[PDB]
């Protein structure tokens, strides 16, 4: 077996490299240090970190959002520190419970939620600028930023775009561990079972495919690490036996194959499509479809099944039944 694919047997140390960027080389703070146990399964060097304007703006806005959330959470346990740790998972900051439409809600019923939403959104935009500009500063393409953009766009969809399209802030995602989980069922119940939303299906198809692709790609590179397949950039520009064997393994298995470069386009595309499909689904939901199951029945797609115990009429529609 190739033990190098499991962990680094003999680690190496050397002077720390610094690639210069078009700006901000002085905003790298911290002194690098080395972790021997990290170095078994990764690169041993931790830090320094770049510390630009957008990154600080992100930390500023983020912490503001975190603080607004934590304070409202603590209010929910009347500031008892012990119950706060006990009940942490169950605590939350909720959008309005009452229907104000799109009017700004009272602070006690969703205003603080809206506030925390604003500052998180600013934090996401600020970090996006960091992710984008750091690439151009180092003379790299902006591929990560465009993937990250789709992920931010999906959050905005469930956070505020879908609420504004249907016209009620009551539909946003709460802040908190269990409560953001509870939203998923409330939403799916409201809109007629999300299994029957084709864009749920698409998103899941791509999410599962990301698991398929990264398991397959990761396994492939490790299987050709003896020929240096991990040095992917120079295998793109000068095809070595590593990527020839990787390409032929798949070709002989499934009948076709990618290149060392194109496999990353596949992976990038699949990842992006998780978020793009999710967003189309949310954008259609509530605006143009009210019950995804009935929409599938309307178009003849839903499965049906025999009764097992007897079919049961809606009692509310029998004559003389109470309301």
């Amino acid at each position: 077996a190739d033990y190098q694919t499991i962990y680094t047997q003999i680690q190496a140390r050397g002077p720390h490299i610094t690639v210069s960027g078009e700006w901000g080389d002085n905003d790298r703070v911290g002194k690098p240090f080395y972790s021997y146990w990290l170095g078994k399964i990764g690169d041993a060097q931790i830090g320094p970190i770049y510390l630009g304007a957008s990154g600080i703006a992100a930390f500023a806005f983020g912490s503001t959002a975190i603080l607004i959330i934590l304070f409202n959470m603590a209010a929910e346990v009347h500031f008892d520190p012990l119950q706060f740790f006990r009940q942490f998972f169950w605590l939350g900051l909720y959008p309005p419970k009452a229907q104000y439409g799109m009017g700004i809600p009272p602070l006690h019923d969703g205003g603080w939620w809206l506030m925390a939403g604003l500052f998180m959104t600013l934090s996401l935009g600020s970090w996006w600028i960091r992710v984008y500009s750091r690439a151009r500063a180092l003379g790299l393409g902006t591929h990560i930023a465009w993937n990250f953009a789709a992920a931010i766009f999906f959050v905005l969809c469930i956070g505020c775009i879908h609420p504004t399209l249907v016209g009620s802030w009551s539909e946003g995602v709460p802040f908190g561990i269990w409560p953001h989980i509870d939203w998923l069922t409330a939403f799916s119940i409201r809109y007629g079972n999300f299994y029957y939303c084709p864009w749920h299906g698409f998103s899941i198809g791509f999410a599962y495919g990301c698991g398929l692709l990264f398991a397959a790609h990761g396994a492939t590179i490790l299987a050709v690490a003896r020929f240096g397949g991990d040095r992917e950039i120079e295998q793109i520009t000068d095809r070595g036996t590593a990527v020839e064997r990787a390409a032929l393994f798949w070709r002989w298995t499934i009948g076709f194959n990618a290149t060392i470069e194109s496999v990353h386009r596949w992976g990038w595309f699949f990842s992006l499509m998780v978020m793009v499909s999710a967003s189309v689904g949310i954008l259609l939901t509530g605006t143009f479809v009210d019950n995804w199951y009935l929409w599938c029945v309307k178009h003849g797609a839903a499965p049906d099944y025999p009764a097992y115990l007897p079919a049961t009429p809606d009692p509310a529609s029998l004559p003389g039944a109470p309301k």
Partner: protein, 332 residues
């Protein structure tokens, strides 16, 4: 952390749909033994003599019974409601027609309520019916009642923690969670849905596309109604010791016909019956109760699904005393 196998499972939908009950035998046995404490029927007595309307002085509900029949009732009532306290719980030792103790007047209304249940709500209690025991289980205060705010523990026979106490505000989220099967849902399904008939449980649209005029802005129900319905369903499931598939094919929670079991219809009647009981029999009794029975808003204790069911899909696993005590209903 975990419950050792095997599990008992049942089937409630077409094969391949994963519908049905999942039960831990130990737990079922412990509930079976708790419920087997149901006292057996007192021996039948011969109907003899005049109606007790002519014999006793203050008999307004049970007036058509004979003396032995009526005293048999009174023995059964004491066994079901106040066995440890005895007949003197409701009566003055020296004047059995005195209404001076509040349990007397309450018991009279409870008699009317119980026969109402067995006569007007057969759509829910069928031929099984209820007795005083179904709720009370041998104590004057039933172990599972609800106030207009959640209380812990669920069984009022256990002693509350400082945090469990309703006046400790830091314990509200936990009081609420334990009523909704430990979910973080931020809604009290009892005051929302079971205390009165003001709210609609259904939230799911019955059309594929959104209907213009109910689908935008303030025309829309807030999403919180869906959280609230879900919370009601968590609470209902936990109260019967069962899961959603007992009543629903989760393919379409809102559909009836093949998508619902007959138990879902019975449950629907149960919601209406509990509303009738609370609005018309139990909530008015804050006039007749001491202040130590009332909640922080002067409300009487009221009933939910757990009051009768106590964690079993049929109260007391289907035990019945209807044929043994005709005077409790149904009434022609």
């Amino acid at each position: 952390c975990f419950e050792p196998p095997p599990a008992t499972t049942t089937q409630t939908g077409f094969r391949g749909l994963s519908m049905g009950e999942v039960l831990h035998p130990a737990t079922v046995k412990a509930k079976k033994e708790r419920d087997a404490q149901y006292p057996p029927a007192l021996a039948a007595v011969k109907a003899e003599g005049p109606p007790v309307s002519q014999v006793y002085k203050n008999v307004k509900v049970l007036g058509n019974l004979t003396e032995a029949e009526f005293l048999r009732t009174m023995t059964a009532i004491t066994e079901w409601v106040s066995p440890q306290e005895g007949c003197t719980y409701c009566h003055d030792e020296n004047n059995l027609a005195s209404e001076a103790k509040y349990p007397y007047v309450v018991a009279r209304r409870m008699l009317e309520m119980t026969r109402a249940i067995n006569t007007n709500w057969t759509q829910h209690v069928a031929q099984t019916g209820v007795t005083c025991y179904t709720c009370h289980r041998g104590t004057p205060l039933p172990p599972y009642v609800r106030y207009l705010e959640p209380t812990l523990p669920l069984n009022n026979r256990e002693t509350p923690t400082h945090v469990e106490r309703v006046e400790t505000r830091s314990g509200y989220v936990v009081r609420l969670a334990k009523y909704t099967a430990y979910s973080a849902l931020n809604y009290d399904p009892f005051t929302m849905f079971l205390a009165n008939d003001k709210r609609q449980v259904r939230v799911v649209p019955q059309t594929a596309l959104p209907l213009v005029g109910v689908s935008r802005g303030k025309e829309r129900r807030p999403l919180s109604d869906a959280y609230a319905t879900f919370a009601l369903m968590m609470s209902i499931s936990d109260s019967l010791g069962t899961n959603c598939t007992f009543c629903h094919n989760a393919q379409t929670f809102e559909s009836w016909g093949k998508k619902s079991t007959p138990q879902r219809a019975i449950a629907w009647w149960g919601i209406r019956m509990v509303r009738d009981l609370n609005m018309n029999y139990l909530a008015p009794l804050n006039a007749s109760l001491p202040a130590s029975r009332l909640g922080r808003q002067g409300e009487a204790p009221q009933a939910d699904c757990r009051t009768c069911h106590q964690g079993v899909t049929k109260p007391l696993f289907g035990a019945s005393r209807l044929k043994d005590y005709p005077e409790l209903g149904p009434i022609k």
